[PDB]
Ligand binder design. Structure first.
Ligand SMILES: c1cc(-c2ccnnc2)ccn1
Ligand SMILES: [Cl-]
Length: 276
């Protein structure tokens, strides 16, 4: 599939940087014709078929294909796509309230109600995606963005569909691997992956939201991965002494090694800690 090849600078003005990764940079921008603001994600293309730098066209097209399908209050949307010889440029919905990661760093830990306020929105977004057979595969606080961080109950949007895949056969078996602290055991063990991997990630996020601590984090990535595979985590009393047993139950039912025994997104929404 080909994208718009006019110079993006002819239609948009760019401003402050909103993100920077291994193969992508995000800049705030403004569409000249409407005055509306967006986030322009510049994804570096591969310069040769055997290169390890840049993102393959197949991977870029997959991300775009998934983004084009989604429209939900808790997921980022795609406005337009441009490309040139060096980059594919996604013009995405602007989410200007910063990462959930940074908001958490500025509060240490959340109350259960604050945590469930965020978590219910994450679950709603993932319910939508999973309903579409879309596995995100990179859920973590850095990939949750607030619309406005200066309100009592911030609204959030899931971003960064760079690892997302359609699961039309129940599982996929490709080169997929996210951030060690948040990946499920099946990712660590290079097993077939499905929608269940995201539910594990939600369990990790929930643990962090309630404690300010990462459940499997080791001193090295390899140690973290080993901890994940062994399900080596516990609820430290210092952090969870006044956390409800039902909150712990929710987490426990997500941080399950066997993906078939892990709570599904529908299960999570009916769990007594979440269900209204
Ligand atoms: C603000 C920032 C972003 C963002 C930041 C970092 N990585 N991907 C998207 C997307 C939308 N709005
Ligand atoms: Cl994004």
């Amino acid at each position: 599939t080909v994208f718009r090849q006019e110079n993006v600078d002819d239609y948009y003005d760019t401003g402050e940087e909103l993100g920077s990764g291994q193969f992508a940079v995000v800049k705030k921008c403004r569409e000249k014709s409407t005055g509306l603001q967006y986030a322009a994600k510049f994804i570096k293309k591969r310069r040769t078929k055997s290169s390890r730098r840049g993102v393959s066209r197949e991977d870029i097209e997959r991300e775009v294909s998934i983004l084009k399908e989604i429209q939900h209050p808790n997921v980022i949307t795609l406005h337009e796509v441009y490309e040139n010889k060096t980059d594919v440029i996604l013009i995405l919905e602007l989410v200007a309230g910063g990462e959930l990661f940074d908001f958490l760093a500025e509060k240490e830990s959340l109350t259960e109600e604050e945590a469930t306020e965020f978590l219910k929105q994450i679950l709603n977004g993932v319910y939508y995606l999973h309903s579409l057979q879309i596995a995100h595969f990179d859920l973590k606080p850095e990939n949750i963005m607030l619309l406005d961080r200066n309100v009592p109950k911030p609204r959030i949007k899931i971003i960064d569909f760079g690892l997302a895949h359609k699961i039309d056969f129940g599982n996929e078996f490709k080169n997929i691997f996210g951030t060690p602290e948040f990946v499920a055991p099946e990712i660590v063990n290079y097993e077939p992956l499905g929608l269940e991997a995201d539910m594990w990630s939600i369990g990790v996020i929930t643990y962090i939201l309630l404690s300010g601590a990462s459940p499997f984090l080791g001193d090295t990535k390899q140690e973290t991965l080993a901890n994940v595979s062994a399900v080596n985590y516990e609820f430290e009393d210092e952090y969870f002494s006044n956390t409800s047993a039902l909150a712990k139950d929710f987490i426990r039912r997500l941080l399950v090694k066997d993906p078939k025994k892990r709570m599904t997104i529908q299960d999570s929404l009916q769990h007594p800690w979440i269900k209204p």
